[PDB]
UniProtKB/Swiss-Prot annotation, chain B:
Keywords: Antiviral defense, Endonuclease, Hydrolase, Nuclease, RNA-binding. The gene is cas6f. Disruption phenotype: Infection with phage DMS3 inhibits biofilm formation; disrupting this gene restores biofilm formation despite DMS3 infection. Normal biofilm formation in the absence of phage infection. Loss of production of crRNA in the presence or absence of phage. Disruption of the entire Y.pestis-subtype CRISPR region disrupts crRNA production but does not alter phage resistance (possibly OLNs PA14_33350 to PA14_33310, plus the flanking CRISPR loci), indicating this CRISPR is not involved in phage resistance. Changing S148A: Cleaves pre-crRNA 8300-fold slower. It comes from Pseudomonas aeruginosa (strain UCBPP-PA14). In this bacteria, Y.pestis-subtype CRISPRs do not confer resistance to phage DMS3 or MP22, but instead are required for DMS3-dependent inhibition of biofilm formation and possibly motility. The keyword Ribosomal protein does not apply. Changing E49K: Restores biofilm formation upon phage infection, crRNA forms. This is CRISPR-associated endonuclease Cas6/Csy4. One of its GO terms (molecular function) is RNA binding. It holds the Pfam family Cas_Csy4. InterPro entries: CRISPR-assoc_prot_Csy4 (IPR013396), CRISPR-Cas6/Csy4_sf (IPR042564).
Length: 298, 187, 51
């Protein structure tokens, strides 16, 4: 019968680190070693936490480490072994049709522009992203990109954008380790107030050790913002790849369950009735496989 | 003044449209300071006064030469994600005119108490009994929250549309696009 | 039992995407190490029990 397993947990690939912040000045970013970090301080307005850059600083210093593991088709916690097997060859045929070419290119777009600076890119007139590929302890090959050229709605093509395509897709296929250190530099302004991740004194700003930082799952959501095959009306842009296409900014969830385009029915249709979805539609299915979940029959 | 430019907010799956225009309204404020001139007007075509909703569309009224330098300024970089812009077309001939004003509020009793300490040298209890905490002003009008380089305190700037008249008055404009005596077309 | 000490299987998900894993195994007799064993976990697979 090949029914859906009760537990269908998938591991989280594309691991993001805690993105710390620090303050610095433009045209000095070549010496990216010892800038002091922005510290969360207490101010009274009710008292809330506020994060501010010093006077002699106008750019951010977001650092985090990214790992590409691979084997996204392998479930860690699967109830049925035969149902586990079918998902293994179903994604294996997907690899044969395309070798993670489109997913890695759109994953490259997330890693190219500083969309993961949610608030610090909108009010910034100049953003630069430094990408380093660390292997064995040394930078095998480096990148210097610009978030201005690569827009957050259109997905353009570039030779250096394709450079990250074969690096990420090789890791996602499971052919080797991929370690990328992503450094960002966005000109938000001299002493402009920054919105980091907020903890729970009515409001608390997150820190790791005397330094403001961004949550790992916060960086991941922007890196999953590639879903453009949802029923886009009103000119909405790319959305984060979520089950049942939920976005909480508008308060409405796209990819409604009443139609045949959500993650749950498309994955069910592919492995149970054994008719493949569209090429554009199946690009969204494995995108949820890579991020993982608590999927399964309830 | 005859030409107008229409800006509508492209919806964001990560920010609400209210947060996007606060960036947009703060960026256009910096345009008038650096470029100069007091002949740049603003209006809200989709201003719903039932729930003080600002809407999703922003309209800018200026001359042809001023609008050319407005788009040529590199402030559009970093804002092309959230917006698209039309063309500097002219306004329709049968357009009644209304005025706009920045109406502030005396929301803080303590701030005015701190003002009179350096003018009349009153005590803390003297200012408390003279000015109670009920003097706060609540405005059921649309507003924007911003931040300034000179003062880092976040301020709520209420934007109000005046009565709709049958003619325009020759007047200047503030740095925020609000009118200090000028009028803008309504359509 | 030596292979499971050789590869870091007790790093359950701490080695699933690790580039290089090294395991050191010492032997204590009177509070001092007598024989030191050094292995490399990436060469020793989790499915093959070789010699």
């Amino acid at each position: 019968i090949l029914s859906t397993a009760s537990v269908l947990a998938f591991e989280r690939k594309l691991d993001p680190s805690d993105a710390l912040m620090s303050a610095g000045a433009w045209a000095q970013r070549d010496a990216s070693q010892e800038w002091p970090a922005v510290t969360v301080r207490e101010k009274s307005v009710q008292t809330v936490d506020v994060a501010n850059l010093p006077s002699d600083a106008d750019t951010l210093k977001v650092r985090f480490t990214l790992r590409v593991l691979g084997g996204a088709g392998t479930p860690s916690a699967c109830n049925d072994a035969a149902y586990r097997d079918k998902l293994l060859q179903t994604v294996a045929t997907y690899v044969n049709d395309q070798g993670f070419a489109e997913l890695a290119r759109r994953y490259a777009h997330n890693l190219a522009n500083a969309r993961f600076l949610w608030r610090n890119r909108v009010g910034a007139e100049a953003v630069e992203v430094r990408i380093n590929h660390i292997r064995q302890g040394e930078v095998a090959r480096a990148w210097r990109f610009d978030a201005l050229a690569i827009g957050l709605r259109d997905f353009k093509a570039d030779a250096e954008l394709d450079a990250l395509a074969e690096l990420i897709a090789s890791g996602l296929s499971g052919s080797g380790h991929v370690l990328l250190e992503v450094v960002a530099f966005a000109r938000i302004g001299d002493g402009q107030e920054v919105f980091p991740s907020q903890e729970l004194k009515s409001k608390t700003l997150y820190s790791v050790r005397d330094a403001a930082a961004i949550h790992s799952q916060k960086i991941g959501n922007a890196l999953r913002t590639i879903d453009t095959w949802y029923p886009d009306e009103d000119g909405l842009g790319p959305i984060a790849v979520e089950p049942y296409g939920s976005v909480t900014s508008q308060g409405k969830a796209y990819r409604q369950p009443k139609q045949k385009l959500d993650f749950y029915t498309l994955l069910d249709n592919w492995v149970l009735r054994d008719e493949a979805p569209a090429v554009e539609q199946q690009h969204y299915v494995i995108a949820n496989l890579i991020r993982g979940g608590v999927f399964g029959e309830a | 003044m005859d030409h107008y430019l229409d800006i509508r907010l492209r919806p964001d799956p990560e920010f609400p449209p209210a947060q996007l225009m606060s960036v947009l309204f703060g960026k256009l404020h910096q345009a008038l300071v650096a470029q100069g001139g007091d002949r740049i007007g603003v209006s809200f075509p989709d201003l719903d006064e039932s729930r003080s909703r600002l809407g999703e569309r922003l309209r800018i009224h200026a001359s042809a030469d001023d609008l050319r330098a407005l788009l040529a300024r590199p402030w559009l970089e970093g804002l092309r994600d959230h917006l698209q812009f039309g063309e500097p077309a002219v306004v329709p001939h049968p357009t009644p005119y209304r005025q706009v004003s920045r109406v502030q509020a005396k929301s803080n009793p303590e701030r005015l108490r701190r003002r009179l300490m350096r003018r009349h040298d009153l005590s803390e209890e003297e200012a408390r009994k003279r000015i109670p905490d009920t003097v706060a002003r609540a405005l059921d009008l649309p507003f924007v929250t911003l931040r300034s380089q000179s003062t880092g305190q976040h301020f709520r700037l209420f934007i109000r549309h005046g009565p709709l008249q049958v003619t325009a008055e020759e007047g200047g404009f503030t740095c925020y696009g609000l009118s200090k005596g000028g009028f803008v077309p309504w359509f």
